[PDB]
Design a protein around this ligand. Structure first.
Ligand code: 785
Ligand code: CA
Ligand code: CL
Length: 223
């Protein structure tokens, strides 16, 4: 997260860290045995780490659970990143409390201007790499479709939305991929891609979760 702030320990209880010997992506806990992340974060050997704040120190509240399986959207396109969403089922269910909790899926899409919270352990420099130990947060608004398409002509599909600041300086970045974009208590986006991090007129692009709720429900109901 570039231009963000320290969230504070366990203030974002649905945030998870996907780990393979190091943190490589974020994700969101939606029920005690399922996590939602981005399809481009897919790899084998994933351990899901819940209740984290400093990812390099065991401080208490952490639950490390292995992934039993990851389900990448069948229409995911790695070249356009269209349908960039993945579901991860946990080997055991997580113990939910106030430090570990799931987030609700939306019943309707969010509109432009909605203020959301983006969090993650990704890079904090727009020019270079500084990876934080603790969770960083950024409050950002959803932009209009016209400004988003004007910023990335021919690259935005109906399953994507832009959120951020056109003046540059505040944005999600590499390492934040797969994590949550929460607006009014509902998971509306997943960190997907952007051109560099916090560059002027190059906002972040997020997977539009309201377009996948029946797919998430049907897939969880059959696995
Ligand atoms: N500007 C943004 N809002 C943004 C957000 C997530 C990103 N994730 C990545 C990303 C970049 C990668 O390429 C690199 F390793 F060459 F930096 C790889 C994975 C990523 O998720 N870039 C990103 C940019
Ligand atoms: Ca820790
Ligand atoms: Cl276009």
């Amino acid at each position: 997260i570039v231009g963000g702030y320290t969230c504070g320990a366990n203030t974002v209880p649905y945030q998870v860290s996907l780990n393979s010997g190091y943190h490589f992506c974020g994700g969101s806990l939606i029920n005690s045995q399922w996590v939602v992340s981005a399809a481009h974060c897919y790899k084998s050997g994933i351990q899901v780490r819940l209740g984290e704040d400093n990812i390099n120190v065991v401080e208490g509240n952490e639950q490390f659970i292995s992934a039993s399986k990851s389900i990448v959207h069948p229409s995911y396109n790695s070249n356009t990143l269209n349908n960039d969403i993945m579901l991860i089922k946990l080997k055991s269910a997580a113990s939910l409390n106030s430090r570990v909790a799931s987030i609700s899926l939306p019943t309707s899409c969010a509109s432009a201007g909605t203020q959301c919270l983006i969090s993650g352990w990704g890079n904090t420099k727009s020019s270079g790499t500084s990876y934080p130990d603790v969770l960083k947060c950024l409050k950002a608004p959803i932009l209009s479709d016209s400004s988003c398409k004007s910023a990335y002509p021919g690259q935005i599909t109906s399953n994507m939305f832009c959120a951020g600041y056109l003046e540059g300086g505040k944005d999600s970045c590499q390492g934040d991929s797969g994590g949550p974009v929460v607006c009014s208590g509902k998971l509306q986006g997943i960190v997907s891609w952007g051109s560099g991090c916090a560059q002027k007129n190059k906002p972040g692009v997020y997977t539009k979760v309201c377009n996948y709720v029946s797919w998430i429900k049907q897939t969880i109901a059959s696995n």
